[model samples]
Target: PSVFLFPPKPKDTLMISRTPEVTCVVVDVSHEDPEVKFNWYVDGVEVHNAKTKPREEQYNSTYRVVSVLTVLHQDWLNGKEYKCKVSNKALPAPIEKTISKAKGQPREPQVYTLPPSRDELTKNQVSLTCLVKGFYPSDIAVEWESNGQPENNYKTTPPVLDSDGSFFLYSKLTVDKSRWQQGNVFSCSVMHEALHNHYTQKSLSLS
Candidate 1:
């Protein structure tokens, strides 16, 4: 975070993160001036809920600040661009950064389908697992289908960031053991932002 006389308008200056409830747009600005002002907007409307923290003076002569604009998860998902405008008394016009719900190049993740053990398959209920790793923007959707029909008896672990900055996601599909053992085919489908019409599908079957 080097101090810039004019904040460079780099492409990644604006970033976004999300949860089931909200989306947070983040911008980190480095400047020598401590009195820098930050304003946020969604479309043309001012956003009053932005959190502007005090200047973090990492060094006595330099400063960095983190301002986050939080919005409804649905609003961001529905494609709203969040604009962050930075201003200083020394500058006549404000410089801006914006983030929208857009596709970043998907670092294709490893997708796998795991079936129940032979011992577990003898029981009343069995579970199939869809394992995924090393992806970004954690909003992956994992779906399950049994014999070409969708199945709802599934649970997905919350996507957590790994130590190396990759994403970890796993989904479990539970079904009656008797149903799985009847020469049925089960498929695990992974939907990512880059793949809508075409998605990753893995299958397991018993003959």
Candidate 2:
């Protein structure tokens, strides 16, 4: 016996309105199912810097970008159409939307990678030094912790930047020999003003 087939549902064009020189267009298909993918096209050509959000299919619902678009005046003409087309193999047809430009600043990167791993070697008295090289800005602080405690042997070192934009961060943690070997864990954490994320390098081992 053959299974009955059904016609595909009509894809709807979500109407979106904006100005070419004063608004940003954010075409997102992350909420679309795995079988579905969204393509962002500007004036017929593909755009490289398209931001896609996370999407799940089991939910069977649409998702939008957490952020909006920031189109530059020079990039978009006063009377130009920026198009975003959403497609899925399961759907018989694709949905397209044309938006005018708007005004807004480009979004910045919210995440940053921490510097190299910290070097740690126990000394005669159990003093360990954790160093993070190549960070930005001159005013930087380092916090040292022992045994997961909030405050412990904290020491701040001088800042030195290489020829590149990166700067340097270093800290020393001094503890009792018994405390270092058995009492606590040694860690070095960096605090930055521009970036909310903190960089931490830890040194832990069993001897």
Candidate 3:
């Protein structure tokens, strides 16, 4: 008699797609079982539109499985988090993968704050420019802060195309020359959807 076969554990990858009407969250699993269960969740809540494919056995007795969950493009764009959980009787734990509305992977924004010098400062106005480069999405905002309050005198350019399919932009803030020489700390803060805590504050000062 042959020994009992070891239960197979699978690996999962999350893929995203969008069309005019719907958005698809495709979970690809490499495993050895066809009857494995798949559960889908959106925003940590149970959602069950996941449909599975056949065993589709391939090389080395391993099977590649596909489980796809779909939702309206409106819902996906309205900020939804998608999750795929796979379970096998013999496996120790279930597999999980997550994504949100073609939002995909967000790239960090590189914030560069530029300080002015004696030669660059004018009579009454000193300008501070911030270059926010190589960030995912046009979902970005820039602000200037001084004296423990937000400054209203500032300008942010529209998003321009950056290398590697990302975006770049500029924000310039003008402050009084006398006020700046007072050693006040001025900061260029960026709010980007791509980053954790939803933002990063880049500070600058002459003092």
Candidate 4:
């Protein structure tokens, strides 16, 4: 027997740039049934008229669509509106997501230290984990320094998305027992949109 099927509903997302020089907005839609249509607009005017290329999943035959809009940073700060409208046969109503500069602005960076993860052989050594959170636009920089000496041997994890739509990063620095016992200072610095030149940092002293 043959089965009748309805297409999957569209999942819409809107992304806006937090940078000043290059301001842009992107609209993305994903569907499993591949029968959804998307529309883009700015300030209520239709845009992105060109055909959108779909990224297809070979295994499940699903597809994703994307669109973009560029504008001046001043216009973005002035509250220019960008929208992604979705239409699907299976869905009862149209779906839309909106993006504006003020809607998802980057928040102040939150810096904190995590409890040390230790080793028996290296008992004298300490692992310092620094967490930076609550910021948007994942192009963030995390740096570790020891006694004003910049250290580049640390590992920085990829940004993780938070429930509030912001991003968080984790970086770890390993220090020897001598540095910790001698009252040497360890610091973690974060650079993000909210704090441009004057980045924020947190310090710890084992002494």
True-structure RMSD, every candidate: 10.2, 17.4, 14.9, 9.3
- Residue 55 alpha-carbon offset, candidate 1, angstroms: 36
Cα lDDT tens digits for candidate 4, 1-207: 011111111111121334232112222323544465667676899876434455444444444444344444445544677666767665667677766654565577789976465452258767778998887766567788876689777899999999988888889887776766677778898766466442778897763
TM values, all candidates: 0.51, 0.35, 0.51, 0.48
Candidate 3, residues 1-207, lDDT tens digits: the string is 001111111111111232322222222333534346667777899976656666566665555556656565445545677766767655568766666543545778999988875786766888888999988766676888887899989989999977688889999888888777887888898876565555688888884
What's each prediction's clash count? 0, 11, 0, 0
Candidate 1 displacement at residue 123 in angstroms = 1.5
Evaluated against the true structure, the overall lDDT of model 2 is 0.43
Better of 2 and 3 by TM-score: 3
Candidate 1 wrongly placed segments (more than 4 Å): 1-80, 84-99, 102-105, 196-198
lDDT-wise, the better of 1 and 2 is: 1
Q: Which regions of candidate 2 fall more than 4 Å away from where they truly are?
A: 1-124, 193-196, 199-207
What TM-score does prediction 4 earn? 0.48
What lDDT score belongs to each candidate, Candidate 1 first?
A: 0.65, 0.43, 0.65, 0.60
RMSD of 2: 17.4
Instruction: Report the candidate with higher lDDT, 1 versus 4.
Output: 1
